[PDB]
Amino acid sequence: MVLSEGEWQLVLHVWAKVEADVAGHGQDILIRLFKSHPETLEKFDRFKHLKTEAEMKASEDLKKHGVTLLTALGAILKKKGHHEAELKPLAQSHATKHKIPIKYLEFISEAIIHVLHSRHPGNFGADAQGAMNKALELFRKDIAAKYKELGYQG
Numbered sequence: 001m002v003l004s005e006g007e008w009q010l011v012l013h014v015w016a017k018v019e020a021d022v023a024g025h026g027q028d029i030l031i032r033l034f035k036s037h038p039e040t041l042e043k044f045d046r047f048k049h050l051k052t053e054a055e056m057k058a059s060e061d062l063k064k065h066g067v068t069l070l071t072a073l074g075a076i077l078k079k080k081g082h083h084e085a086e087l088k089p090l091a092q093s094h095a096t097k098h099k100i101p102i103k104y105l106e107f108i109s110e111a112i113i114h115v116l117h118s119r120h121p122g123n124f125g126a127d128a129q130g131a132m133n134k135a136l137e138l139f140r141k142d143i144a145a146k147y148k149e150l151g152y153q154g
Ligand code: HEM
Pocket: 040, 041, 043, 044, 045, 046, 065, 068, 069, 072, 073, 089, 090, 093, 094, 098, 100, 104, 105, 108
């Protein structure tokens, strides 16, 4: 798939707002993902034990990882499709070390879209959401193709 420049602009305009508070968006997203699909929490051996949203909100570690995650995702979006290099190390660790099924990447894509919609309704109308969705489908498709070359296709 190929996004047009206008779609990338809609994606990088709402991402510039996310970058005004990387840690808070990172937290929101991971929590939304763990509340919505609790099974994904089990993948994190470092967070697994957290029992409530209040415990999640108070975890410094979780908030630090959320920054790591968004930083990595942001560097991929700013490439505007030319992300081959960035994707390599990410696909290798999630497919071989962490073992993250494609289905989970769909779950966190849904969490990202929920959170932008709640925080940024004025910059995340229907067209901007269809473009973000197009950009995350691209990402998932390329990661899935790499998973396959690596021997996991999960
Ligand atoms: C937007 C999608 C994703 C991005 C950009 C992303 C990015 C990262 C980054 C940059 C790291 C650290 C370096 C490395 O291990 O590669 C990381 C680690 C990790 N990620 Fe992801 N990730 C994504 C989705 C997921 C999902 C959906 C899960 C699981 C439900 C997952 C589970 C983990 C785990 C288990 C670690 C290790 C955490 C720790 O250090 O103990 N990732 N991910």
